[PDB]
Amino acid sequence: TVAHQITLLECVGKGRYGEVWRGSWQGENVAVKIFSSRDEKSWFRETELYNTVMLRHENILGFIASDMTSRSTQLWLITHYHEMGSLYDYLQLTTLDTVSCLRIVLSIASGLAHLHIEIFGQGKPAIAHRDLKSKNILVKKNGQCCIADLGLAVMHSQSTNQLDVGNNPRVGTKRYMAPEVLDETIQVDCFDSYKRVDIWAFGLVLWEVARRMVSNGIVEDYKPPFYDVVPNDPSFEDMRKVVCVDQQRPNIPNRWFSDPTLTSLAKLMKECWYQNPSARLTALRIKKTLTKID
Numbered sequence: 001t002v003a004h005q006i007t008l009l010e011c012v013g014k015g016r017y018g019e020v021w022r023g024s025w026q027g028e029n030v031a032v033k034i035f036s037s038r039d040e041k042s043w044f045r046e047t048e049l050y051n052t053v054m055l056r057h058e059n060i061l062g063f064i065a066s067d068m069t070s071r072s073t074q075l076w077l078i079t080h081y082h083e084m085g086s087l088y089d090y091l092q093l094t095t096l097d098t099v100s101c102l103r104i105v106l107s108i109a110s111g112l113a114h115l116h117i118e119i120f121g122q123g124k125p126a127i128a129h130r131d132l133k134s135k136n137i138l139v140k141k142n143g144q145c146c147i148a149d150l151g152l153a154v155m156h157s158q159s160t161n162q163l164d165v166g167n168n169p170r171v172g173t174k175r176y177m178a179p180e181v182l183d184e185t186i187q188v189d190c191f192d193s194y195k196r197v198d199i200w201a202f203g204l205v206l207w208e209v210a211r212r213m214v215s216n217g218i219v220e221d222y223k224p225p226f227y228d229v230v231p232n233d234p235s236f237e238d239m240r241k242v243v244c245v246d247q248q249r250p251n252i253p254n255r256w257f258s259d260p261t262l263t264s265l266a267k268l269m270k271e272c273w274y275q276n277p278s279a280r281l282t283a284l285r286i287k288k289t290l291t292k293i294d
């Protein structure tokens with residue numbers, strides 16, 4: 001396998017996802033994610049999606065191989081290596097201009113609309129991600145991004161009209177959970193519920209990015225969504241009180257209203273955050289609006 005022709009060179013991150021290494025695949029740099037022993041289901045689900053679907057797009061992390069190897073058993077997922085790393089890390093490294101901000105959020109919208117749309121082709125089922133955040137989006141050398149971490153993905157096919165929810169005890173990152181997830185009101189048998197959860201998450205990511213775009217000499221420091229009202233590693237109950245009971249949304253800095261681009265992005269992210277999931281914009285409507293914005 002690719003794993004047997006692959007040498008780990010250096011650990012570029014460790015956390016809740018497991019570990020990510022820069023590896024050498026017959027000399028070529030690749031990313032190797034080593035799953036936690038507790039997270040076999042995420043490895044199995046991502047491997048399943050990458051191997052069984054035509055999941056190949058500029059704005060989705062490029063799959064090379066999955067592998068099992070001794071070191072106990074380790075489960076590896078081998079992909080394209082993006083030397084700039086995650087959007088989370090990148091937003092701490094730098095501020096953005098108008099072109100850079102729009103290129104990042106349009107590229108995320110394009111990946112997410114590509115996951116959400118069924119293609120009959122060639123083709124692919126509709127896919128909801130269910131754990132979108134700035135830490136599982138990669139920054140590419142051209143300034144576009146790509147979406148990673150499909151281990152919670154849910155699939156729908158119009159031909160069979162069947163929802164494939166998989167079998168993974170993992171739940172989303174608590175900070176990014178939509179209100180319907182947190183108060184357990186989500187309609188688990190309707191595919192559209194899952195897409196709407198991605199739109200809430202995407203809204204928070206748009207907020208994270210937009211804070212870092214400079215306008216009229218002013219920029220915000222990088223903060224995660226709800227930095228002001230929940231602690232690090234917030235509990236399910238911490239989040240439930242903020243989003244379901246108090247019905248709070250991230251604050252729009254006043255300085256955005258002196259910039260045409262940030263004014264349009266403030267409009268967009270609030271229509272991602274309707275408490276009523278049915279009222280949120282779709283990934284395709286977001287893509288179209290971002291293509292028009294200057």
Ligand SMILES: CN1CCN(c2ccc(Nc3nccc(-c4c(-c5cccnc5)nn5c4COCC5)n3)cc2)CC1
Binds near residue numbers: 012061082085
């Ligand atoms: C300050 N910095 C900058 C960049 N860093 C860095 C550099 C390169 C990469 N490369 C990379 N390429 C592809 C995927 C991933 C990856 C993946 C990944 C890899 C393989 C399969 N599926 C997901 N998960 N995560 C990441 C990175 O962020 C944490 C979560 N990383 C990373 C960081 C670390 C610290």
